[PDB]
Amino acid sequence: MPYERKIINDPVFGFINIPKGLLYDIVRHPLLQRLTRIKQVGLSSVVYPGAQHTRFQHSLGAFYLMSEAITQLTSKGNFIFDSEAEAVQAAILLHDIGHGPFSHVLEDTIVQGVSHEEISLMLMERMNKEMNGQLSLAIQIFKDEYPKRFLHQLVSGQLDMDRLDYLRRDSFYTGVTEGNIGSARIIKMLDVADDRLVIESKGIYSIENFLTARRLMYWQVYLHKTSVAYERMLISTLLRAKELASQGVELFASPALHFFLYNDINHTEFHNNPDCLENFIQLDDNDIWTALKVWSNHPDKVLSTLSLGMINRNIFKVENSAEPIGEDRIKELTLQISQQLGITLSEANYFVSTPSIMYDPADDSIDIIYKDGTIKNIAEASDMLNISLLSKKVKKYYLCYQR
């Protein structure tokens, strides 16, 4: 019998219908509300000022597409029980809950060796306790431990609701191009064969488009050189903060940020000391920006110069090469920066970065189902271009340094 719903506005996909009960209670939970304070692609806003969308919007967006995908799969003779529908919807609402601000930066700096996927499971278990086991089936699906295995695939896999949301929403908000991966269309082509997700043959060119757009998104947005440079500055800022902290230097920070600056939190500490998760939960983009804003006037020349560059958008110069960067160049620039900033040679390392560089080539193996029940790999189904070659490794070296 039809359920009552709350309605949220989403410019990308329209009206998001949220059933009252568990699902709406997830949306209103403090753990999902904190995602209104974490940008989806916060390192991209420096290139693409419109990229202000939140991880909250992504999670609702992915939910929307999940709802639609349930309806479409049932319509095609794939039975899904109401509890499975509910479970897969709660999974998708929660899938990204373990992201902190600039999550990958944190994993490389002050919250080392713990991944957002691990934190998402902890936070789901925590919430399941609070909701007295109502998320158990969601978690079981999330962990791919449920016998109906296409349901997990909707949460995590080549055709997951997560990437069908973010690839579209990130493009929509950056304004990078005016093109459109067909997220709502892709979902209407979805079916199950042998307990795995396939796409109907009428959706073939949509999948080639999808697969191509995905690679272009990486080059145009995610691996854009200005955003890589910006990321390297943030990594250096926080590693310098932790070095100063360890020396007992005083740094402005909210209590939750202070926890990770003045303690050495690593994988084992994080899982064993419950204070870590409690403090992690209290971190969002505000904690990071507030630090950078205050640090920009800190006496330390390295921390202040980095921090001021972040807030005032004085971005490192970036060069890219097809071959590694020569030790000669690095030494040269480090010296010149040492001199220009009046810092030691070792301090000048913070101002020179040489990061390397796509995703699992198997993501490109989508199976297409024909009206006569036959199945082909998209690479054979395809007419537009050579899908096999979309995954040829492109080696791209970056040189980032103070300008």
Sites for ligand ADP among residues 22-51 (CB under 6 A): 27-28, 46-47, 49
* Least Å from the CB of residue 377 to a copy of itself: 14
Query: Of 51 and 161, which CB lies nearer to ligand ADP in the complex structure?
Result: 51
Please return the burial class of 10, using the count of CB atoms within 10 Å of its CB with bins 0-12, 13-18 and 19+. Answer: middle
The two tokens of residue 376 are: 């082909």
If the CB atoms of residues 55 and 232 are measured against Cl ion, the closer one turns out to be 232
State yes or no: 71 annotated in a binding site.
no
Binding residue (CB under 8 A) for a copy of itself from 4, 82, 194, 360: 4
Distances (CA, A) of 184 to 18, 42, 187, 326: 18, 25, 5, 47
From the list a copy of itself, ligand ADP, Cl ion, none, pick the one residue 315 interacts with, judged by a Cβ distance below 5 to 8 Å according to partner type: ligand ADP
- Binder to a copy of itself among 18, 54, 170, 343 (CB under 8 A)? 54
Q: Is residue 303 within 8 Å of residue 295, measured between CB atoms?
A: yes
Residues 329-358 that bind a copy of itself (CB under 8 A): 358
| Residue 115 contacts a copy of itself per CB under 8 A | no
Question: Which residues is 321 bridged to in the sheet?
Answer: 397
Region 255-284 residues binding a copy of itself, contact defined as CB under 8 A: 255-256, 282, 284
User: Is residue 54 annotated as involved in ligand binding?
Assistant: no
Which residue of 18, 60, 93, 233 would you call a contact of a copy of itself, by CB under 8 A? 60
With CB under 5 to 8 Å by kind, the binding choice for 215 among Cl ion, a copy of itself, ligand ADP, none is: a copy of itself
Kindly state whether residue 83 participates in binding a copy of itself, applying the rule CB under 8 A. Answer: no
Q: b/e per residue, 240-255, with b = 16+ CB within 10 A?
A: bbbbbbeeeeebebbe
Binding site annotation covers 369?
A: no
Whichever of 4 and 323 has its CB closer to a copy of itself, that residue is 4
Does 121 engage in binding with a copy of itself (CB under 8 A)?
no
Site for Cl ion, rule CB under 5 A? 81, 177-178, 182, 185, 206, 209, 355
Binding site residue list? 7, 24, 202, 225-226, 313
Binding site residue list for ADP? 7, 24, 202, 225-226, 313
